[PDB]
Amino acid sequence: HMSLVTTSTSDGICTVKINRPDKLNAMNTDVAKELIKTFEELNHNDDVKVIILTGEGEKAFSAGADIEYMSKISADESVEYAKTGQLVTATVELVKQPTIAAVNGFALGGGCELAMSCDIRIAADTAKLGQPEVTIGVPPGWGGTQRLMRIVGIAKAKELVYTGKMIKAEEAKEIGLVNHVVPLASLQEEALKMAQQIAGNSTMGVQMSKVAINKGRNADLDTGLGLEILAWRNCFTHPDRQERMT
Amino acid sequence: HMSLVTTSTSDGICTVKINRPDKLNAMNTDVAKELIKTFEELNHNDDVKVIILTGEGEKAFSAGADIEYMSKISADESVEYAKTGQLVTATVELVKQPTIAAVNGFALGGGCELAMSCDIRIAADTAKLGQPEVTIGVPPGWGGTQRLMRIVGIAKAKELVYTGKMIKAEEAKEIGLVNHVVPLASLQEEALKMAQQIAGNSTMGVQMSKVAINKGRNADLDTGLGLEILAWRNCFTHPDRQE
Amino acid sequence: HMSLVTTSTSDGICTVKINRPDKLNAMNTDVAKELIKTFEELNHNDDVKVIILTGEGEKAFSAGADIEYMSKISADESVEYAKTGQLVTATVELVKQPTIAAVNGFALGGGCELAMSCDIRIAADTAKLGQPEVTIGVPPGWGGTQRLMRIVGIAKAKELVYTGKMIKAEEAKEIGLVNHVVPLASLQEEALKMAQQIAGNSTMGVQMSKVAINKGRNADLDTGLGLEILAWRNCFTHPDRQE
């Protein structure tokens, strides 16, 4: 169902738009499977620097909460969705290439947990955000409880989880979730401002840094420096360290 | 020396008030044990689905650093005033049911740590927070420093820990010290607007996230994915999933 | 190389100033060591209560990302270059009293890594933060990837590290990078004001709270809670509690 084009300065920006408008980008197993293949075949591709994560068309980014609901099973098979859900939520946040959740339209349900998987959660001002997983009696399982609370904090993380109501993109700008609130079709052009300003930088000083921030939150301050100095030492062994010193 | 009222749609939400009005609902030895006994020692019943908390009177919530000066004892007699409040701040936030903090005017000193021992803090335009215990030679109460830095952050906590600054309640929302801001007169009804919404959704949908949320705030992220999976699996073993 | 002054009420505030304004006060391997002895290697004298740090010139605090950089050989010495910052950032973070950063102008690169190590940051209206160290080719040196993940947030800290650019004080005010933003004409005077409220406070309460918080950010809430209680009864034998 996925789509992709590869074009930028020196050939390529990995535009990924989940294309299945009938169910409004609902996150099933297949829409969770092909993401791995399209993001792990992209793992060893040296011709793509920056990745933008957007939704197809003009309807929504992902609306799998109140649209995709077939979970009438025993609880044993629920873990298989939990294991598969965690196989997709973190594999986007662990791709070395900087990925941006270029959110447009509705981004609740799976998209509520998928949007928080990128680096900068820049979203369309049309985005109505929320986590309507609790309204059916089940807390989010793909990582919406232990990843959100480290982004906006804990004072506000309770409000959008305990309640289960939809909030706007402008309202989300006061909590630190969305790092920039900007229009949707400009977000197509305005992301390219930030999708090649990133590319205009080095090729190793960005992804190697991504190995330090994405793993320094799980360790204390002293151990956090323990990973950063080697990364400072590792990027110190690149031809890009001395090329741009002019 | 207190009171509690429980009623909601299907009789789910509760309301507890510190009904000691004479000294403005301060925190001391005799009241702290009441708060730990009233919430019933780490757990509550199934009939109650949410516990709203505020201060009776429409005046200050708690003047815990203005008239409470029972602190002339030996250094071996301070554990009972330090550990008990930690126990007081241990299971107010960790009870197996959501708690909403209807902040109500003053929260100076020990009263603030009780407020920080709550989930959601619906504020009002009359509050005057602050922890001016450092001005007397002692850190804030019963876990102010560690909790506050986890809510607001590492930058804006030192500015309140070191100073004991006054600050208003409109700029308290500027730092994330509270969650929602509404007029004081409508605060009682506005707090109900959230409680009935937290009551009408589900029970297992919150209690299996309340346990998950209140355990992963300290450890790593992969460990944070540990309890959630077992909690998520546990929440599919109830008919509420099919409802 | 350096110039420091000390004059206020209670005789406890220190105005540490970097005195290399000709070269835009950019950090290197010889001025960082000059700032190690200035704070006296994890401790200081008994004549201080507060600390103020700000580069001399009133034009740029410590801009040292694209104004001064010499390392283009001997990649093994990068740890030797990275260790110096860690020794210069662990000393300030641990130091007995809080350090007030009255940054006025540019603060990028290694200089950006200095204000964030301070307890409280107050910036002038024309503040230009953000590390362009990524444009050079290597990630930030003595933190950046670490010290910014507990101040502003995990999402709004990626933007500065990845892109690499300069923003204004009001944006840093909005994101929370610098707590309070004041006009350049009312910052150096105001830095001498926030400290003076501290300077009239308890001597043992401010020092203990800094120790209690700076080592409680690194563990669990339950297991970092011990830091406060241990320091809680450490100030119950000094006259500050009673007098």
* Nearest Cα to Cα of residue C102 among C10, C184, C200, C207: C184
Q: What share of chain A is helix, strand, coil (3-state, %, to 5)?
A: 40, 15, 45
Say which CATH architecture domain A2-197 belongs to.
Alpha-Beta Complex (3.90)
B161 at C interface, C-beta within 8 A = yes
How many Å lie between the alpha carbon of C8 and the closest alpha carbon of chain A?
34
Contacting subunits of B (3+ beta carbon pairs below 8 A): A, C
User: What is the amino acid identity at position A171?
Assistant: E
Contact of B198 with chain A, judged by CB distance below 8 Å, is answered with yes
Q: How many CA atoms lie within 13 A of C29 on its CB side?
A: 10
Indicate the burial class of A141 (C-beta count within 10 angstroms; 0-12, 13-18, 19 or more): buried
- Picking from B137, B154, B155, the nearest residue to C235 by CB comes out as B137
Using the Cα atoms of residue B117, residue B119, residue B125 and residue B130 in order, give the sign of their dihedral.
positive
**Contact assessment for residue A14 and residue A160, using Cβ atoms and an 8 Å cutoff:** no
Start and end residues for every CATH 3.90.226.10 domain found in chain C: 2-198
- Ramachandran assignment for C103, one of left (phi > 0), alpha (psi -120 to 50 degrees), beta (any other): beta
**DSSP state, A66?**
S
Nearest residue to A229 via CA among A200, A243, A208, A246: A208
Chain B environment of C208 (Cβ under 8 Å): 139
Q: Is A155 helix (H, G, I), strand (E, B) or coil?
A: coil
- How far is the CA of B177 from the CAs of B130, B153, C177, in angstroms? 11, 10, 17
| Known catalytic membership, residue A133 | yes
Across A18-39, b (16+ Cβ under 10 Å) vs e yields bebeeebbbbeeebbeebeeeb
Closest CB to A86: pick one of B194, B225, B231: B225
| Total residues found in chain A within this entry | 246
Every domain range in chain C assigned CATH 1.10.12 = 202-242
| Cα-based torsion angle of the residue sequence A119, A122, A126, A127 in order, rounded to the nearest 10 degrees | 20
Residue of chain B with shortest Cα separation from A132:
B201
* Spatial CA neighbour of C35 closest among C3, C76, C72, C75: C3
Residue with tokens 């929370």: C176
Contact A115, A138 (CB under 8 A): no
At residue C14, the 3 state secondary structure works out as strand
CATH topology classification for B3-198? 2-enoyl-CoA Hydratase; Chain A, domain 1 (3.90.226)
Name the residue among B92, B128, B106, B14 with its Cα closest to residue B58.
Answer: B106
CATH 3.90.226.10 intervals, chain A:
2-197
The two tokens of residue C216 are: 């409680």
B133 is an active site residue: yes
> Residue C164 in contact with residue C144, Cβ under 8 Å?
no
Is any Cβ of chain B less than 8 angstroms from the Cβ of C238? yes
Q: What's the CATH architecture for C202-242?
A: Orthogonal Bundle (1.10)
Whether B205 and A135 lie within 8 Å, measured CB to CB: yes
How far is it, in rounded angstroms, from Cα A71 to Cα A85? Answer: 14
Q: How far apart are the C-alpha atoms of B97 and C94, rounded to whole Å?
A: 39
Q: Which residues of C touch A98 (CB under 8 A)?
A: 162
In angstroms, how far is CA C35 from the centroid of its own chain? 12
Cβ pairs A/B, distance under 8 A: 135
Looking at the complex, does the CB of residue C161 fall below 8 Å from at least one CB of chain A?
A: yes
Q: Are C133 and C140 in contact (CB under 8 A)?
A: yes
Both structure tokens of B208: 């299996």
Distances B91 to B64, B179, B209, C227 between C-alpha atoms, Å: 19, 21, 16, 20
Residue B217 contacts A, CB cutoff 8 Å: yes
List B40, B41, B133, B170, catalytic entry? B133
Task: Please name the residue that has the structure tokens 């000393």.
Answer: C91
CATH architecture of C2-198: Alpha-Beta Complex (3.90)
Resolution for the entry shown, Å:
3.4
Phi and psi torsions of B13, nearest 5°: -100, 145
Distance CA B142, CA C173 (A): 30
Q: Which residues of chain B have a CB within 8 Å of the CB of C221?
A: 146-147, 150, 217-218
